[PDB]
Amino acid sequence: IKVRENEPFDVALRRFKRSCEKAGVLAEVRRREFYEKPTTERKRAKASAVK
Amino acid sequence: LFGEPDEGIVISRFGMHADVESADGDVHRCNIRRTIRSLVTGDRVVWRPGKVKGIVEAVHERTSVLTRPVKPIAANIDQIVIVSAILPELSLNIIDRYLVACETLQIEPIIVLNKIDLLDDEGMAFVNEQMDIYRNIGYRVLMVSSHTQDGLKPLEEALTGRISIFAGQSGVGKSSLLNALLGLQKEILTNTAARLYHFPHGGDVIDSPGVREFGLWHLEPEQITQGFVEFHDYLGLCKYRDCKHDTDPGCAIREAVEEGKIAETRFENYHRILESMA
């Protein structure tokens, strides 16, 4: 969030806490999320992560 | 199967068979033997009846002057009619692609502008100017309407004694002209064995709609070049090896373009064609 940037300003030193913030939820709202793809899911919903 | 050898010209590709119009003129739907394979519509064939069904067991497809992938369709096509209208989008490279090919093949283009009538005073003019680039480049333009099938006599007369063909894009009223020419519609279209027809003023014409909505065929680099002879002259212009017709210091061809000594389109087309084979 903050790294007391007194200097840094290209990097932010942040990639944690996305679950209501940044790219996590914010990319999926006014862009389409389908229903003939998470219809795979029913069966497929836990496998593609770390990857 | 065997029968009695007789000559014929293959009037039509009968799908499964080929239909042969005999030397007499008699059309015989003929089989085509496992033994022969160099057959196309237009071939003069030895076909035989049975002892209609015929059988074909000799052919005569004369030298290349057009292909698709890269396989001759016929021969004695002394002119290629590159017929266009704008459907379903179009480009200068597309006519030129055909031109480059006409030029390569050493089959004469007669560039036919369809829908001339469709094209307004400004539009017709613009298109004529474009048609002129090619024309200036050497490929005569005949203003026709696809629909109205105008300039039909100048075309016909160009057809006399020779065989011609219909090239372009998604039923760009090529199909329409063909109908006029024939004087019988045998095609419309809008948005290698096929069938052949014979002209009265002399000469012949070959058609297929399938060709007409377009994709395009395999080719080699030199041919594209052949498509543009002005480049040869530019090749000589810088060095005893001019870079490669394309930019690099001392690329005359490139320079000639920079100058506009060559039209840009030729170079551009040279590229669309070049890329596709690759």
């Binding site: 790294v3 007391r4 007194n6 300003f9 209501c20 389409r32 | -």
Partner: protein, 117 residues
């Protein structure tokens, strides 16, 4: 509008671009420059560059407000929260602290759904 020489670098990064407004800490807007306003209107604005310049072009023209202390308040996710923050702190400032800002959406509206090729 206003100054205190402490500002905020609102970086409004944007998909094919990145627009940047430096704002007083207080508010206003003080400059703005985009990334697809760092001309670009292609893959070009879809460059970080687009941003670099975006921010830069904003970040200079806010120091009218004396701004030289910025929190950066990163907004937008365009190719410009590197380049743009570049050109926001470093654009006549000492960055005083960074942050990224967001709410709990619950929306209304339907966005698009059109494509399928």
């Amino acid at each position: 509008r206003k100054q205190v020489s402490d500002g905020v670098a609102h970086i409004h990064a944007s998909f094919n671009n990145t627009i940047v407004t430096i704002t007083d800490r207080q508010g206003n807007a003080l400059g703005w420059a985009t990334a697809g306003g760092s001309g670009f209107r292609g893959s070009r604005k879809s460059t970080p560059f687009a941003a670099q310049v975006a921010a830069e072009r904003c970040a200079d023209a806010v120091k009218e407000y004396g701004i030289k202390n910025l929190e950066v308040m990163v907004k937008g996710p365009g190719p410009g929260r590197e380049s743009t923050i570049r050109a926001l702190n470093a654009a006549g400032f000492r960055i005083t602290n960074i942050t990224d800002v967001t709410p709990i959406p619950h929306n209304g509206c339907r966005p698009p759904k059109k494509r399928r090729v």
